[PDB]
């Protein structure tokens, strides 16, 4: 297969240096010219730079001209795209993509994500959303639980222990002033299983090496 | 095969896009590896076959659409150059009083041609003549 | 300096229908037009080439078509794995741009937000903190407003919502709203109150409870 594959995601502190790389399988890498792409969270593609392996050509957008340094080791097939010192809006996804005479990206990399934050790791508290009257309607109960105060992203949910996916809502993680993420998920049940049916959100963290498991119980309100 | 590094100019080229050149005035000039390929050799023809130097980029003609075409193409440098280069690659170097032209193999009476105004791009078809400015 | 516009942002759409994108560039260019799709969570893939041309893979649903400034990509009629967001590109000797991207969204009929309201964990209070959330389930279209009023003074600047993508079932949005205090802030006030406004209800919703009701 024609391949590209980014290196992985990375988390940083401003004002480090960052190296990300790119490297290319199942044809010639010499050949071909490489570029990365920028997309910020929620936002659209923008060009950065490009590079021809072979004689290491570079160009840059005028708007990441100095900025950022765009290399290449052609004895690896690798291209790279690095940092002097981070700053936080440096936070995006960076895509890497071989550039054709037909004049298009034919093959993307799979991206890298970086998150340039001060934060340190930590795991998340985890707090039960309790059914109750305030949560009931047409037979049926929402119940949840709130995943606060976690870096980096991300966190996985499941319910009892992947038995129960249906009317799961997992929610976008939100950054709070804390430089903290939080996020919710719920689901709703039949409010006559609510006596009994115990509901357990299990909450991964990978980052911080933390599972929890919390039981979510019904509140008479 | 035999390479020798050279320029062109007209009656100055340049790479004015990752796979594109274009045809102005005046030294950031496209030097090519001109090599001798097999073919039809005749009185002041000879095929040849151009490159850039130190880029794996390769002048060949295609049909794009149904019209033939000049393009810049990749190829891998293990393979290439070779005697035997394939027709697109394939030009008909022709010298004629103090200029050469030339024209596709694959698709006769096809040049390289350039405009008569400035930054324009090099093309398939008007300038079909041309100056070579032969380097280290 | 070459800027390619694309409309609409969002194009929504029933599954089946006919998909209408388009790219203006800012001036006249050769039909070098690129246009790529980006699924969600996934990298962009290329799916037309110079204009017109489908790129290897790709399905004949998808085609391309225009020249000088106009360019349209269609999908004739539209799958699950169609509803995406779609760039189109070009390239100026050294310069490669890109549109700013058309998400196509799912068109279905109107619906209403159930409204949930959970009161602080007993868990959470020990800590020092209360979070209020306000879920709105299951509504269509996107577009909802939210409000917080303790004691009915209008909260302003300590909430933060979030969306999740169209459910694959039944193609609406869910939303997540989170106010955050301190648990002194909290003891202090008595009425919480979420506040909901969205096309499929005929008045605003409030969902509320009192500081002291659930245990």
């Known amino acids: 297969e024609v391949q590209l594959v980014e290196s992985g995601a990375e988390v940083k502190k401003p004002g480090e240096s960052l190296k990300i790389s790119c490297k290319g399988s199942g044809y010639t890498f010499t050949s071909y010219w490489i570029g990365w792409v920028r997309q910020m969270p929620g936002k659209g593609l923008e060009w950065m730079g490009i590079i021809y392996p072979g004689d290491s050509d570079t160009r840059y957008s005028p708007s990441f001209q100095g900025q950022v340094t765009i290399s290449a080791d052609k004895s690896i097939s690798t291209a790279y795209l690095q940092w002097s010192s981070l700053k936080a809006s440096d936070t995006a996804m960076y895509y890497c993509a071989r550039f054709v005479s037909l004049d298009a990206f034919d093959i993307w990399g799979q991206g890298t994500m970086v998150t340039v934050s001060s934060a340190s790791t930590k795991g998340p508290s985890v707090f039960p959303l309790a059914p109750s009257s305030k949560s009931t309607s047409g037979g049926t109960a929402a119940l949840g639980c709130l995943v606060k105060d976690y870096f980096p992203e991300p966190v996985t949910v499941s319910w009892n222990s992947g038995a129960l996916t249906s009317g799961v809502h997992t929610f976008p993680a939100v950054l709070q002033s804390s430089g903290l993420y939080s996020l919710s998920s719920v689901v709703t049940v039949p409010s006559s299983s609510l006596g009994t049916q115990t509901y357990i959100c299990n909450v991964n963290h990978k980052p911080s090496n933390t599972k929890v498991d919390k039981r979510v119980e019904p509140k008479s309100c | 095969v035999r390479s020798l590094n050279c320029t062109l100019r007209d009656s100055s080229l340049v790479m004015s896009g990752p796979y594109e050149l274009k045809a102005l005035h005046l030294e950031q000039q496209v030097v090519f590896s001109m090599s001798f390929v097999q073919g039809e050799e005749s009185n002041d023809k000879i ?33 290439y150059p070779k005697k035997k280069m394939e027709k697109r690659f394939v030009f008909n170097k022709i010298e004629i009083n103090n200029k050469l032209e030339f024209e596709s193999a694959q698709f006769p009476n096809w040049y390289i041609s350039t405009s008569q105004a400035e930054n324009m791009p090099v093309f398939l078809g008007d300038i079909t003549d041309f100056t070579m400015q032969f380097v280290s | 300096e070459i800027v390619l516009t694309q409309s609409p942002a969002t194009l929504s759409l029933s599954p089946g229908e006919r998909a209408t994108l388009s790219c203006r560039a800012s001036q006249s260019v050769s039909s070098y037009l690129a246009w790529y799709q980006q699924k969600p969570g996934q990298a962009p893939r290329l799916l037309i080439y110079d204009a017109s041309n489908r790129a290897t893979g790709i399905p004949a649903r998808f085609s391309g078509s225009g020249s000088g400034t106009d360019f349209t990509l269609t999908i004739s009629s539209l799958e699950p794995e169609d509803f995406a967001v779609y760039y189109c590109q070009q390239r100026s000797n050294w310069l490669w741009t890109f549109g700013q991207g058309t998400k196509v969204e799912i068109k279905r009929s109107v619906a209403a937000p159930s409204v949930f309201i959970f009161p602080p964990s007993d868990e959470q209070l020990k800590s020092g903190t209360a979070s209020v959330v306000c879920l709105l389930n299951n509504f269509y279209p996107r577009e909802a407003k939210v409000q917080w009023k303790v004691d009915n003074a209008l909260q302003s600047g300590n909430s933060q919502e979030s969306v999740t993508e169209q459910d694959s079932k039944d193609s609406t949005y869910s939303l997540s709203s989170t106010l955050t205090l301190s648990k002194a802030d909290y003891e202090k006030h008595k009425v919480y109150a979420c506040e909901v406004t969205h096309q499929g209800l005929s008045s605003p919703v409030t969902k509320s409870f009192n500081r002291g009701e659930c245990e």
């Open chain 2, 47 to 79: 095929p040849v076959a151009l490159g850039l130097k130190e880029k794996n980029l390769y002048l060949s003609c295609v049909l794009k659409d149904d019209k033939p075409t000049l393009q810049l193409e990749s190829v891998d440098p293990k393979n």
